[PDB]
Amino acid sequence: PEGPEVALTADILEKYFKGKTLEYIDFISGRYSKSEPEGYDDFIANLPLKVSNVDTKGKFLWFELFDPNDKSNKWYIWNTFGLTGMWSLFEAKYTRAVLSFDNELMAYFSDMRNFGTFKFSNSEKELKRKLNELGPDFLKNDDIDISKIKKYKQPIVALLMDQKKIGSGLGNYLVAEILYRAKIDPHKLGSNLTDQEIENLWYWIKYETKLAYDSNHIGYMVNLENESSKIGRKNYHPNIHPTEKEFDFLVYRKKKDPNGNKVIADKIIGSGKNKRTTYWAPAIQKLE
Ligand SMILES: [K+]
Structure with missing residues (x-):
């Protein structure tokens, strides 16, 4: 979760x-x-x-x-x-x-x-x-300034996976789905992103978290699926309006993305029990 x-x-x-x-x-x-x-x-x-x-x-x-x-x-x-x-x-x-x-x-x-x-x-x-x-809280805070991303010369995937540096709430699947939507290569250093990409990234974080939150069966809280659909949702990120009715993995644990491009099950961050697999499609996400 x-x-x-x-x-x-x-x-x-x-x-x-x-x-x-x-x-x-x-x-x-x-x-x-x-x-x-x-x-x-x-x-x-x-x-x-x-x-x-x-x-x-x-x-x-x-x-x-x-x-x-x-x-x-x-x-x-x-x-x-x-x-x-x-x-x-x-x-x-x-x-x-x-x-x-x-x-x-x-x-x-x-x-x-x-x-x-x-x-x-x-x-x-x-x-x-x-x-x-x-x-x-990346989901609950609607006025977060992620420009702090520039001050770090580390892979953006690590910065978003971290719960303190920029924001909290993002996990292995959200970071993968968000970086795919923003077409950003996981390895790209924070300090190398353009102000435009920052703006674009911010947009997709709000987008994905909201889509995830509004969903009823992503799979990680199956014991509350019956109740998930029997309760409403708070209005986080009010000005962002996801089009899909349910959250769907575009690259997380997929062999290929929607179009057909290949997805790399790349192990970038973490050591031992903290190591995680980042999924991304080199065709869409570039270091630019
Ligand atoms: K007392």
Whole structure:
């Protein structure tokens, strides 16, 4: 899941749990099964608490809770999905966390690979500190200045994959689809892009994120597909109007692009577990 999936999941989470009373959380399997997340014990001891919001910034999601009997007791649930992390209203296969609310309400987080993370904290300061680690939300921020791209002599694919330098929310498929639409070669250094290309790139980031966010079944949040179509969408990037009804991969994991050009499954950024495969068609994307 990338920026859009996280945001749409938060939206759904708020629809069902905002204002509800959380009573407990169980980590029944996975990485937290035996060793609970940081702050878990203190958090459990302070439950029940009501949920006031479920917000996101890029790929980062969090629950904000408060204590109905102590205005000063505020708590937060930090969450990152990882490659296989999914939220749902039913106990799906590979459920790792089970959130029990009052009045029959239940939420679940599934994660076959166990890359998602959890953390509980009662500090707004730490939350603000954490949010400073992320750049503007490429999907939610409609007035982002990406001219900072010029100050970097690094492949543009690395700059867009990074969550701090220019903005947050872009993943391996969004960056590939966006660089294809902007006809820019992944290896092109930021400092070598023209002001025009910058403008053009900005346009397509808004375009793709919005298309992704408005979709109902891209595939990375299948446990919420039924609910995805039973809820609306916020109006991010208002002045951009994608023509397609659903997000479709033009090069991401494709052997050829729409026209017929070949797509290179190029491994440009990352090391070890962080290495990712960038898909691009040399026919369309040039270093110019
Ligand atoms: K107090």
